Design an enzyme around this catalytic site. Structure first.
Site, PDB file in Angstrom:
ATOM      1  N   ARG A  47      -9.767  -9.527-111.254  1.00 44.59           N
ATOM      2  CA  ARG A  47      -8.851  -9.008-112.249  1.00 44.59           C
ATOM      3  C   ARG A  47      -8.498  -9.998-113.386  1.00 44.59           C
ATOM      4  O   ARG A  47      -8.466  -9.616-114.560  1.00 44.59           O
ATOM      5  CB  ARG A  47      -7.585  -8.441-111.599  1.00 44.59           C
ATOM      6  CG  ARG A  47      -6.885  -7.504-112.532  1.00 44.59           C
ATOM      7  CD  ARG A  47      -5.516  -7.177-112.048  1.00 44.59           C
ATOM      8  NE  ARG A  47      -5.175  -5.930-112.701  1.00 44.59           N
ATOM      9  CZ  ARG A  47      -4.072  -5.733-113.405  1.00 44.59           C
ATOM     10  NH1 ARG A  47      -3.160  -6.724-113.492  1.00 44.59           N
ATOM     11  NH2 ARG A  47      -3.893  -4.539-113.991  1.00 44.59           N
ATOM     12  N   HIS A  51      -9.219  -9.272-117.294  1.00 45.15           N
ATOM     13  CA  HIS A  51      -8.143  -9.280-118.278  1.00 45.15           C
ATOM     14  C   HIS A  51      -8.186 -10.366-119.366  1.00 45.15           C
ATOM     15  O   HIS A  51      -7.722 -10.154-120.500  1.00 45.15           O
ATOM     16  CB  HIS A  51      -6.800  -9.307-117.557  1.00 45.15           C
ATOM     17  CG  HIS A  51      -6.392  -7.943-117.092  1.00 45.15           C
ATOM     18  ND1 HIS A  51      -5.082  -7.516-117.058  1.00 45.15           N
ATOM     19  CD2 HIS A  51      -7.144  -6.892-116.683  1.00 45.15           C
ATOM     20  CE1 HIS A  51      -5.046  -6.257-116.649  1.00 45.15           C
ATOM     21  NE2 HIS A  51      -6.282  -5.857-116.414  1.00 45.15           N
ATOM     22  N   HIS A 174     -12.533  -1.699-108.512  1.00 51.05           N
ATOM     23  CA  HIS A 174     -11.328  -1.216-107.826  1.00 51.05           C
ATOM     24  C   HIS A 174     -11.437  -1.134-106.327  1.00 51.05           C
ATOM     25  O   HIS A 174     -10.444  -1.280-105.652  1.00 51.05           O
ATOM     26  CB  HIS A 174     -10.787   0.098-108.417  1.00 51.05           C
ATOM     27  CG  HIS A 174     -10.064  -0.102-109.705  1.00 51.05           C
ATOM     28  ND1 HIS A 174      -9.920   0.885-110.653  1.00 51.05           N
ATOM     29  CD2 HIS A 174      -9.485  -1.209-110.225  1.00 51.05           C
ATOM     30  CE1 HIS A 174      -9.237   0.407-111.681  1.00 51.05           C
ATOM     31  NE2 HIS A 174      -8.966  -0.864-111.443  1.00 51.05           N
ATOM     32  N   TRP A 190      -7.388   1.101-103.163  1.00 48.63           N
ATOM     33  CA  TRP A 190      -8.380   2.103-103.523  1.00 48.63           C
ATOM     34  C   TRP A 190      -9.284   2.487-102.359  1.00 48.63           C
ATOM     35  O   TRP A 190     -10.003   3.482-102.450  1.00 48.63           O
ATOM     36  CB  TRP A 190      -9.257   1.650-104.681  1.00 48.63           C
ATOM     37  CG  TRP A 190      -8.602   1.665-106.023  1.00 48.63           C
ATOM     38  CD1 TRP A 190      -8.628   2.678-106.922  1.00 48.63           C
ATOM     39  CD2 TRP A 190      -7.891   0.577-106.657  1.00 48.63           C
ATOM     40  NE1 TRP A 190      -7.954   2.325-108.062  1.00 48.63           N
ATOM     41  CE2 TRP A 190      -7.491   1.040-107.937  1.00 48.63           C
ATOM     42  CE3 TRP A 190      -7.536  -0.738-106.263  1.00 48.63           C
ATOM     43  CZ2 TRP A 190      -6.753   0.242-108.836  1.00 48.63           C
ATOM     44  CZ3 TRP A 190      -6.828  -1.526-107.159  1.00 48.63           C
ATOM     45  CH2 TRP A 190      -6.438  -1.026-108.429  1.00 48.63           C
TER      46      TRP A 190
END
Ligand code: HEM
Ligand SMILES: COc1ccccc1O
EC number: 1.11.1.5
Length: 293
Positions: A47, A51, A174, A190
């Site tokens: 992540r 990002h 995910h 998820w």
């Protein structure tokens, strides 16, 4: 009017220097295995790589992985980045040990290392991101909303120069972790507990019985009888027929998914960077396991 950001190899460094940094990340990932209820730091690092890269704007070459600008207040305090401080903090002793690696190189490498150590595909990775100053830090609001539909996701990703296949491949990351109500206003995983990169995101979308529910933050998310969840933007991938076909393709071909994810995730991490004709080739790091470490 795009900025040009030329990759500049950290002075004198070669594949064997970056393998060491990879090993340090991977060794700490093995070591700090209690984090987020024994999930470890792998998903938060993936992540963080996304990002720090996904602020890019193809139109003027602002944001992107090159500058390593997450290290500055404005970007680390982005609401979209809530929770990523954990990943930054994981990486601090790596940066301390290897003060020569640029921030953007360490952010991006952390994601490559996580994916690979979780037995995901090999992601080729190039060095040469160079730290840029505080006033190059992109403004908040360039990362995507979770409460939107397929049209939004399609349009959003066009700014990152990603097509439907690439968007569907990327999202399958995910499968790795979970949403945390305090970070994002969404809660739950998820998929199944796991310490392995798979294609389960696509299998879950297709095979779980999903119910549109409100979570404790008063936001809708798709919930399953297994205790799994999907964001509206995730669920959008089975509502749009073009997305749906690709979801089915990856649900039915783990190798195809690995290959496409590897390509897209490398592209993501490399957007905005000009590599000289005599830049080194991408490095493919060996996992600790392939090294017998
Ligand atoms: C429309 C696109 C996307 C949206 C709306 C979105 C949104 C979110 C949200 C809300 C979370 C949970 C944050 C938290 O509470 O900790 C999350 C987690 C995560 N995201 Fe995405 N994301 C998108 C695309 C991507 C892409 C392209 C990648 C990387 C290829 C990615 C990788 C991850 C990973 C690994 C986690 C788990 C983090 C953890 O377990 O701590 N996402 N995302
Ligand atoms: C500004 O220093 C850092 C860069 C990347 C990761 C961890 C750090 O402490």
């Amino acid at each position: 009017t795009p900025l040009v950001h030329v990759a500049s190899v950290e002075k004198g460094r070669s594949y064997e220097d970056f393998q060491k940094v990879y090993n340090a990340i991977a060794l700490k990932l093995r070591e700090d295995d209690e984090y987020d209820n024994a999930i470890g730091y792998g998903p938060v690092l993936v992540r963080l790589a996304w990002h720090t890269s996904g602020t890019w704007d193809k139109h003027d070459n602002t944001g992107g992985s090159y500058g390593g600008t997450y290290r500055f207040k404005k970007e680390f305090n982005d609401p979209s980045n809530a929770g990523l401080q954990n990943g930054f903090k994981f990486l601090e002793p790596i940066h301390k040990e290897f003060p020569w690696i640029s921030s953007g190189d360490l952010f991006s490498l952390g994601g490559v290392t996580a994916v690979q150590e979780w037995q995901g595909p090999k992601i080729p990775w190039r060095c040469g991101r160079v730290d840029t100053p505080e006033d190059t830090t992109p403004d908040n609001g360039r990362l995507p909303d979770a409460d939107k539909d397929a049209d939004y996701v399609r349009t959003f990703f066009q700014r990152l120069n990603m097509n439907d296949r690439e968007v569907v491949a990327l999202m399958g990351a995910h499968a790795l972790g979970k949403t945390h109500l305090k970070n994002s206003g969404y809660e739950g995983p998820w998929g199944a507990a796991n310490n392995v990169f798979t294609n389960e995101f696509y299998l879950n979308l297709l095979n779980e019985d999903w119910k549109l529910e409100k979570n404790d933050a008063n936001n809708e998310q798709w919930d399953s009888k297994s205790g799994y969840m999907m964001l509206p933007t995730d669920y959008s991938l089975i509502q749009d027929p073009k997305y749906l076909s690709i979801v089915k393709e990856y649900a039915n071909d783990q190798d195809k998914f690995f290959k496409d994810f590897s390509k897209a995730f490398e592209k993501l991490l490399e957007n905005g960077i000009t590599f000289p004709k005599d830049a080194p080739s991408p490095f493919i790091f060996k996992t600790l396991e392939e090294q017998g470490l």
